[PDB]
Fold this sequence. Notes:
The structure is cut from a larger assembly and holds five copies of chain A.
Chain A: H1 2-6, E1 23-24, E2 30-31, H2 38-47
Antiparallel strand pairs in A: 1-2
Protein name (chains A, B): ADP-ribosyltransferase binding component
Amino acid sequence: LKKLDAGKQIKLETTQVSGNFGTKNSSGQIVTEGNSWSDYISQIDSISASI
Amino acid sequence: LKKLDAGKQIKLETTQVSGNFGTKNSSGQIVTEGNSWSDYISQIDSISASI
Amino acid sequence: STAVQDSNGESWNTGLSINKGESAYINANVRYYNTGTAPMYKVTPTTNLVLDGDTLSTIKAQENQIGNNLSPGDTYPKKGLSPLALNTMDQFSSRLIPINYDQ
Amino acid sequence: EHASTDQGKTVSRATTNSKNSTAVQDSNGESWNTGLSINKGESAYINANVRYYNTGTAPMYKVTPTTNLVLDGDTLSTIKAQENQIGNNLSPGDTYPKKGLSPLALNTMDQFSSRLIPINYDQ
Amino acid sequence: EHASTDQGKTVSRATTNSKN
Lengths: 51, 51, 103, 123, 20
């Protein structure tokens, strides 16, 4: 608290993010449950180059 | 609290809303479970224009 | 015999109270790395904090320290960021690691 | 326990006028107080350093023991390893903390790993 | 129960002047 009040600044970093995506079942409904993007982050980062 | 008592006004702004819709199963029973409008909000706002 | 007595008094008091069972709290700044051949999903380690020859406590990363993805040859806090904090002890991330006065 | 230390500094100035006779009195005062407070049911906490081993013929997954802490002839408590003391794997002839590491700590008592084992003043 | 033990040490000085 003393360091905060002295003038030092405090920063926030986005360590990670998690969330689902939307697919289709037999019907026309869009389902987003148990479809975590975290399942594909590593593979996509491994086999692709960023621009 | 001092700012509140001085005369400043505090506002409430809606950020988002979540809720289900109703479909029909094999029977005539209306089912509203795991049917979140959040699955369609992004697509509907993306492909349509508001009036 | 009459008498009038006026009096003024100032007092300054300081007080330090301390419990000697939960005499301090600790948190750690740690970082996960991988050296195998395959990626690991939803990484969670069980770790031991030990002081001299006494294991201070065993902590399992409950929900705020779970590494979603670990690719081979890469850390979970990918290089450039800062290490992660490890303070909470109980399951629902509401407690802090206590140490007594001797420790 | 609870140890409290208190320091106090007092300064007083008084004036008496009687009938005549005047008087002025100044006063300085210093106070040091120590205080030790203690309970009698939760008079102390304990934490154990233990280690699991296996001597059978098959590996054991998700090991969790229910153990009794007994002092002289009175079972102090019964503790089941809830979440921070569960051995994921136990191969035959091998301890859970692999030889080289340190024993594991058994302190928490309730189900959601938020409590300490209490002992009263007599124990 | 709840047992508390307190120890206290006080030192005071005072100067009075009347009229001498």
